[PDB]
């Protein structure tokens, strides 16, 4: 793998939680501070149906699914699969929301970095038909046999794009809120039968969460999800929207977000109709920060920026002019300073306070669109 290891002092583990087993239950990948750093063996894209889903998203046919699976089917991401939770402290929690055509495992560079700095991160899989694929179980017996029911991205007609994208962002916000409720309930002793049979005992999460230090983070469709979630759910104390795609949001949302909100944009994705909606969030009674990463494209926030070499990266728009490792470091470090500021963490993340103001060779303060 070329997906970077976490830069923080904690070793990082990974597992999957589905509860309840149904299409209305919560599904998330958990990245967390590990007790042991035994081996970096987590499978990046762990089922073949996700390659079929990716293929349908990219508008290709049956054959490209099998090529992507041949290329990436065994690629790992640097986290200890089912490693025990590091005991004796309460961790801040991030709920993470993926963009259109993605699913829970494709922001491991972001999730492993936050975990290596002492966060638990819950990367949610959406059941809104925005994921390229996702699964659930029709009953408890199906969950015991591993007899998965698959759900693939919904292709939309232009006529319905406004209505359905707004219905999707509302469901997505409900899913971020449900996932938070699952983790907080486990933190306070709710017994849960994970619908997946994994060596990670969810009991370990008992009294492991710092309940006042909760953030929501998301990319693209996920950035819109950040804003919807903040508007509905004051348990989320701040939001970080990575290249927010603002189109799905209703105008009622902009006046309802008291929490601090951070926009981290790619230089090469943003456009005036998008930026104006970001600027409708600004108000002298609210904390809003915006930076742009110089030489970055949309995909610099996701794991596919690390999946290919420099030249094929640029050809496919998975990489920009900036180094993929340098982009994600600026994103993760800026995020850490912001989470230290607005969650009241007692760490050294304030060293990167300058990246929040866009003070780096590789950052623009605010936006090039200005």
Residues marked as catalytic:
220, 243, 298
Buried b or exposed e, range 58-80, using 16+ CB within 10 angstroms? eeeeeebbeebbeebbeeebbbb
Question: How far is residue 92's CA from residue 209's CA, in Å, rounded to a whole number?
Answer: 6
The helix-helix angle for 324-343 and 108-116 (nearest 10°) equals 50
Question: How far is residue 234's CA from residue 260's CA, in Å, rounded to a whole number?
Answer: 11
DSSP 34-78: ES------EESS--HHHHHHHHHHTT--HHHHHHHHHHHTT-EES
Query: What is Dmax (Cα atoms) for the chain?
Result: 56
Please write down the HEC assignment for all residues of 51-62.
Answer: HHHHHHHCCCCH
Question: How far is residue 276's CA from residue 225's CA, in Å, rounded to a whole number?
Answer: 17
> What would the two tokens of residue 6 be?
């976490």
Residue whose pair of structure tokens reads 């008992």 in the numeric block: 206
Question: How far is residue 335's CA from residue 352's CA, in Å, rounded to a whole number?
Answer: 9
Residue whose pair of structure tokens reads 């994921």 in the numeric block: 131
> What would the two tokens of residue 344 be?
């009241």
Structural contact between residues 357 and 262, judged by C-beta atoms closer than 8 angstroms: no
Structural contact between residues 51 and 73, judged by C-beta atoms closer than 8 angstroms: yes
């Amino acid at each position: 793998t070329k997906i970077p290891r976490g830069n923080g002092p904690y070793s990082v583990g990974c597992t999957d939680l589905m509860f309840d087993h149904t299409n209305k239950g919560t599904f998330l990948r958990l990245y967390y501070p590990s007790q042991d750093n035994d081996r970096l063996d987590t499978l990046w894209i762990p089922n073949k149906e996700y390659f079929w889903g990716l293929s349908k998203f990219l508008g290709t046919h049956w054959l490209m699914g099998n090529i992507l699976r041949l290329l990436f089917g065994s690629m790992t991401t640097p986290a200890n699969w089912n490693s025990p939770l590091r005991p004796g402290e309460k961790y801040p929690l991030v709920v993470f929301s993926h963009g259109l055509g993605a699913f829970r495992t494709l922001y491991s560079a972001i999730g492993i970095d936050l975990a290596s700095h002492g966060f638990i991160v819950a990367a949610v899989e959406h059941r809104d038909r925005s994921a390229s694929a996702t699964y659930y179980f029709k009953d408890q017996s199906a969950a015991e046999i591993g007899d998965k029911s698959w759900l693939y991205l919904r292709t939309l007609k232009q006529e319905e794009e406004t209505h359905i994208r707004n219905e999707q962002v509302r469901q997505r916000a409900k899913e971020c809120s449900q996932a938070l409720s699952l983790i907080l309930d486990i933190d306070h002793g709710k017994p849960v039968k994970n619908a997946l049979d994994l060596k990670f005992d969810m009991e370990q999460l008992k009294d492991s969460i710092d309940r006042e230090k909760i953030a929501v983070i998301g990319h693209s469709f996920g950035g819109a999800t950040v804003i919807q979630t903040l508007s509905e759910d004051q348990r989320f104390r701040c939001g970080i929207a990575l290249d927010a795609w603002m189109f799905p949001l209703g105008d009622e949302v902009y006046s309802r977000i008291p929490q601090p909100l951070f926009f981290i944009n790619s230089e090469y994705f943003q456009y005036p109709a998008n930026i104006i909606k970001m600027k409708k969030c600004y108000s002298p009674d609210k904390e809003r920060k915006m930076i742009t990463i110089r030489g970055s494209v949309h995909q610099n926030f996701a794991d596919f920026t690390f999946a290919t070499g420099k030249i094929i990266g640029h050809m496919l728009k998975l990489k920009g002019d900036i180094d993929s490792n340098v982009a994600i470091d600026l994103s993760n470090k800026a995020s850490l300073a912001f989470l230290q500021k607005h969650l009241g963490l007692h760490k050294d993340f304030d060293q990167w306070d300058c990246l929040i103001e866009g003070d780096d060779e590789n950052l623009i303060p605010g936006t090039n669109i200005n």
